[PDB]
Amino acid sequence: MINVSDLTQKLPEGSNAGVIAKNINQNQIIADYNGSTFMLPASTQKVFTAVAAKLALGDQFQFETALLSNGKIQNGNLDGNLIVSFTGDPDLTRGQLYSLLAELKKQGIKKINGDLVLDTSVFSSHDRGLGWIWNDLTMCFNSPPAAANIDNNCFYAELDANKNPGEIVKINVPAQFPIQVFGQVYVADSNEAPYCQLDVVVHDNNRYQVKGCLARQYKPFGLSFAVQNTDAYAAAIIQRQLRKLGIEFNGKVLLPQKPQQGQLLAKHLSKPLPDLLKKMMKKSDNQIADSLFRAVAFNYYKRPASFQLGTLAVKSILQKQGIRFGNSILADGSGLSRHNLVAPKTMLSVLEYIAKNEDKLHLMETFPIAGVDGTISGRGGLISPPLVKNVIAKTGSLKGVYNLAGFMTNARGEKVAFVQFINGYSTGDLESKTKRAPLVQFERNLYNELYKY
Amino acid sequence: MINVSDLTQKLPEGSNAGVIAKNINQNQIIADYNGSTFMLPASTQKVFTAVAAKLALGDQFQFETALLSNGKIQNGNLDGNLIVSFTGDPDLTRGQLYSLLAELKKQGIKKINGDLVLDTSVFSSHDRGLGWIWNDLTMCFNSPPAAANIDNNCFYAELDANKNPGEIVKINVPAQFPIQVFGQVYVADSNEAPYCQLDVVVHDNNRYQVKGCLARQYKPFGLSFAVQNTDAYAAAIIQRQLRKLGIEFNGKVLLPQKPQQGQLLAKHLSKPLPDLLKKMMKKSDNQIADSLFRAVAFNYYKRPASFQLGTLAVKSILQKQGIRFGNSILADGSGLSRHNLVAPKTMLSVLEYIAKNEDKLHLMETFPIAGVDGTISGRGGLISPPLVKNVIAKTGSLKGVYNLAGFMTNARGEKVAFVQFINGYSTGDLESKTKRAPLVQFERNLYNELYKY
Numbered sequence: 001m002i003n004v005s006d007l008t009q010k011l012p013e014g015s016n017a018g019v020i021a022k023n024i025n026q027n028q029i030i031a032d033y034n035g036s037t038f039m040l041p042a043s044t045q046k047v048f049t050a051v052a053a054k055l056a057l058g059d060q061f062q063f064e065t066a067l068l069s070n071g072k073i074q075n076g077n078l079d080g081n082l083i084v085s086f087t088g089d090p091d092l093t094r095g096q097l098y099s100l101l102a103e104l105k106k107q108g109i110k111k112i113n114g115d116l117v118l119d120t121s122v123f124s125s126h127d128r129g130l131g132w133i134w135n136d137l138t139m140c141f142n143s144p145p146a147a148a149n150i151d152n153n154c155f156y157a158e159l160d161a162n163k164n165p166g167e168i169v170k171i172n173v174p175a176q177f178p179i180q181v182f183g184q185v186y187v188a189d190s191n192e193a194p195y196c197q198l199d200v201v202v203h204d205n206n207r208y209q210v211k212g213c214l215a216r217q218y219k220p221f222g223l224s225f226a227v228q229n230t231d232a233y234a235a236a237i238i239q240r241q242l243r244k245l246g247i248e249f250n251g252k253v254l255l256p257q258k259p260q261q262g263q264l265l266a267k268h269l270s271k272p273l274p275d276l277l278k279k280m281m282k283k284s285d286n287q288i289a290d291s292l293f294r295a296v297a298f299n300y301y302k303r304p305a306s307f308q309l310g311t312l313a314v315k316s317i318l319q320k321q322g323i324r325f326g327n328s329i330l331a332d333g334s335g336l337s338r339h340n341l342v343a344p345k346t347m348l349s350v351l352e353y354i355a356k357n358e359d360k361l362h363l364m365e366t367f368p369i370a371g372v373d374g375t376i377s378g379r380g381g382l383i384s385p386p387l388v389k390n391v392i393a394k395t396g397s398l399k400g401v402y403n404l405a406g407f408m409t410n411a412r413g414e415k416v417a418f419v420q421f422i423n424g425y426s427t428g429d430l431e432s433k434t435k436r437a438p439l440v441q442f443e444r445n446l447y448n449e450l451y452k453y
Numbered sequence: 454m455i456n457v458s459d460l461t462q463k464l465p466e467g468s469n470a471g472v473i474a475k476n477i478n479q480n481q482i483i484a485d486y487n488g489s490t491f492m493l494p495a496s497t498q499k500v501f502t503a504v505a506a507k508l509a510l511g512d513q514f515q516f517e518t519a520l521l522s523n524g525k526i527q528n529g530n531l532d533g534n535l536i537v538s539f540t541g542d543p544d545l546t547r548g549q550l551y552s553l554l555a556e557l558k559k560q561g562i563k564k565i566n567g568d569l570v571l572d573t574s575v576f577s578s579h580d581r582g583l584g585w586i587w588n589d590l591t592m593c594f595n596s597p598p599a600a601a602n603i604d605n606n607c608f609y610a611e612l613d614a615n616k617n618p619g620e621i622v623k624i625n626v627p628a629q630f631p632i633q634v635f636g637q638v639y640v641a642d643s644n645e646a647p648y649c650q651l652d653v654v655v656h657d658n659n660r661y662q663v664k665g666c667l668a669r670q671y672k673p674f675g676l677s678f679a680v681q682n683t684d685a686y687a688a689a690i691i692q693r694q695l696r697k698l699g700i701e702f703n704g705k706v707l708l709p710q711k712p713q714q715g716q717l718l719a720k721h722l723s724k725p726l727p728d729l730l731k732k733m734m735k736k737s738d739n740q741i742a743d744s745l746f747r748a749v750a751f752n753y754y755k756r757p758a759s760f761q762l763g764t765l766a767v768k769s770i771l772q773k774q775g776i777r778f779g780n781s782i783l784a785d786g787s788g789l790s791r792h793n794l795v796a797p798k799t800m801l802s803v804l805e806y807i808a809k810n811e812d813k814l815h816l817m818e819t820f821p822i823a824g825v826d827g828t829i830s831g832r833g834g835l836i837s838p839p840l841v842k843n844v845i846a847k848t849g850s851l852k853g854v855y856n857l858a859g860f861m862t863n864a865r866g867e868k869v870a871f872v873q874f875i876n877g878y879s880t881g882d883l884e885s886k887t888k889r890a891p892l893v894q895f896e897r898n899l900y901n902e903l904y905k906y
């Protein structure tokens with residue numbers, strides 16, 4: 001087998017690597033280094049989720065976002081409640097919700113007499129994975145994959161810190177977001193600056209307090225925040241859009257937390273599963289993975305889905321297809337949780353299942369292609385012949401974690417499936433910029449070995 | 454050396470072990486297995502914190518909680534604000550705070566004309582380490598090591614779950630706690646019960662939303678919770694206490710972040726560093742570990758202390774003594790963070806420094822003793838000769854991690870220092886207490902072999 005142990009000498013000291021690879025044509029394992037050790041899969045976990053969604057939702061699955069009413073339209077009045085049903089669509093934009101509500105106008109409604117009622121009942125318990133880290137939860141990459149999701153549950157604010165030391169940074173939030181950012185951040189001199197922390201503290205109802213300080217900035221300083229209360233935000237968006245559509249509403253916003261019945265007035269459909277999967281796999285969209293992860297459980301078990309149910313469903317579905325998980329911990333669909341534990345060989349058996357059932361699943365074309373698209377279009381170790389346009393691979397990255405899982409063609413034309421997990425990769429301070437040169441070398445060498453073996 | 458490899462076969466499949474041990478007398482490494490791999494040290498991290506505290510704070514160090522004012526007493530009146538100074542004392546009781554406020558009365562203050570002002574400026578930024586897990590923040594083990602800390606920053610509620618399936622559990626907050634618990638928990642029948650989560654969501658001003666279910670319990674019981682907003686909690690307690698004391702107060706609560714200059718009116722001192730350290734090391738008190746961690750930074754750098762500053766301070770101080778960290782990540786003092794990355798051989802070097810410098814530091818007596826005290830009084834693998842009353846060791850535990858770091862005497866009366874890091878331990882999932890039997894066996898055999906070598 002490949003001596004992976006020599007190859008890891010290029011990785012920073014203290015890191016650990018799990019590598020396993022199989023020549024599918026020969027059915028030979030050609031690299032096996034820590035192949036049974038549990039490690040953190042990061043976003044390569046999405047491979048499990050792609051397969052469970054294909055099997056249990058199918059290619060016609062679309063998320064639905066719907067308007068319903070318990071009462072009747074007469075004389076331009078909806079005489080009853082506007083029920084807006086959200087089921088986790090991770091790709092719903094503000095524009096798409098606006099056009100959906102517009103459909104009320106076409107049906108002649110110019111006034112709602114009752115209350116606005118959100119049904120978000122398809123998802124339950126928290127909208128975040130267990131073992132997620134607390135202090136990223138305000139960042140856009142980590143937005144909550146909740147039943148109600150508008151513009152990725154993320155908004156942008158601008159901090160004007162182009163001012164002298166001692167001045168208060170100016171916070172600018174575009175008027176379209178119904179949230180509030182407040183607080184007193186100050187500009188610090190070159191002496192104080194290295195000691196600054198720019199913090200945000202989350203308060204009820206989507207109020208954000210920025211505190212702390214930063215160095216004078218010489219461009220505008222973006223802050224890209226995750227919406228924290230997704231029902232309240234969606235309800236406030238809906239009210240402003242009704243107003244702008246000219247539909248009169250003066251009732252309350254109700255969040256009853258169980259399914260709501262009424263007559264279907266209008267349904268917006270997301271793009272279908274193969275489109276969602278392509279985007280989740282090429283670009284590694286976290287919210288699409290955790291949305292699908294719970295949609296899978298909702299549909300499989302026919303009950304409100306928590307992350308716990310999503311875990312149970314994905315395992316049971318894959319186990320029926322012959323995958324064995326032993327004591328693996330899959331706490332989420334995106335792999336963000338620091339509690340996930342999976343051995344390279346388990347990921348590998350799903351990758352072989354993927355290659356073997358390609359005529360039914362069509363998941364091959366979803367993998368990023370080296371030097372061509374997705375998250376490895378510019379991946380340093382992979383961008384030269386004979387790897388470029390050959391390796392395709394799902395990536396995963398967290399602080400300290402750099403993983404690949406995918407396929408390639410070797411020098412004899414045979415297909416190789418492989419899994420690379422690297423954990424404990426550290427090249428400086430907790431806050432400083434990670435150096436990828438040791439990663440680039442290691443990956444260039446390993447995939448070259450796999451090519452030539 | 455000892456064949457640790459053979460020993461790690463009794464550990465559960467997928468787990469990963471890092472083990473290193475040095476015969477101090479012979480200056481010889483006698484076990485070296487993944488000794489250079491970064492792993493999660495859990496609460497063995499507190500060894501680093503103990504040493505930094507000894508060195509930079511010293512045996513005379515005590516946390517001060519203080520009352521000051523800028524007004525003068527006159528007619529039983531305090532003609533200005535009462536400033537209450539909190540500096541992170543992790544061992545402050547509600548009784549102690551009361552006795553401190555009593556001093557206001559011994560001095561004849563009848564009422565305070567002004568506002569209540571809390572000075573917490575010695576700590577800075579968040580009171581939670583980076584890379585701590587969000588869903589545990591409500592547990593008492595994980596209560597915030599904030600500046601203001603009263604009775605471990607922990608409370609309980611009374612629950613009554615002796616009801617039938619479908620019925621609501623009764624949750625009453627005891628009168629002494631200024632906290633709300635809201636929402637509701639139902640009793641689950643024997644079916645649901647296996648897969649029940651009790652969810653707790655934090656809202657502003659120490660309001661806790663509880664949701665989900667519990668299994669029927671015949672008898673009433675208490676659940677502990679971490680206080681979340683510690684400033685508010687503290688201030689609510691101070692105001693109850695001033696009433697109970699008969700000191701009239703009708704002003705505002707103010708929470709500036711800059712230190713508050715004023716005339717000292719009274720003060721209370723915690724127990725001094727050696728008692729703090731012994732309780733930390735013996736009982737593995739996370740709050741003492743994280744307060745000391747930032748108290749180290751505050752005194753070392755003479756400026757307000759974030760966890761990032763604590764990291765800098767602890768490394769700098771141990772570096773001065775010869776310890777080399779390379780690219781380790783020490784994100785907190787308690788070892789709770791999932792971002793911590795330390796190799797066994799680094800922890801081993803600090804243990805060698807501890808034993809070498811015992812005459813000055815007196816840390817050996819802080820370690821739990823096998824079969825005797827602290828967290829290893831009943832540790833399974835250590836409770837028979839020749840290990841009982843011999844092995845001393847700081848433990849560390851998280852989901853998936855079972856570590857030991859400390860010393861023992863071998864058959865020749867030589868001292869052996871050792872580090873045992875086990876990660877990726879899983880014999881079950883996120884919803885199952887894993888069996889500790891393979892760990893008992895591993896440890897028994899490992900320490901027996903280090904005994905006889």
Ligand SMILES: *C(=O)[C@@H](NC(=O)[C@H](NN1CCNC1=O)c1ccccc1)[C@@H]1N[C@@H](C(=O)O)C(C)(C)S1
Nearest residue numbers: 042043044136141142284286375395396397398399
């Ligand atoms: C999956 O690996 C996923 N990674 C992240 O989202 C990762 N996020 N973190 C780290 C801790 N909390 C987070 O939200 C991350 C890593 C680096 C930069 C931003 C975010 C996605 N997969 C990655 C990949 O394919 O390599 C990314 C494209 C970076 S995001």
Ligand SMILES: *C(=O)[C@@H](NC(=O)[C@H](NN1CCNC1=O)c1ccccc1)[C@@H]1N[C@@H](C(=O)O)C(C)(C)S1
Nearest residue numbers: 495496497589594595737739828848849850851852
């Ligand atoms: C150090 O290891 C520390 N461990 C814990 O506090 C640990 N806390 N966790 C686990 C997940 N999030 C947390 O806050 C824990 C583990 C098991 C049971 C309770 C708490 C302290 N040291 C441990 C030890 O010395 O073994 C404990 C005595 C359990 S607490």
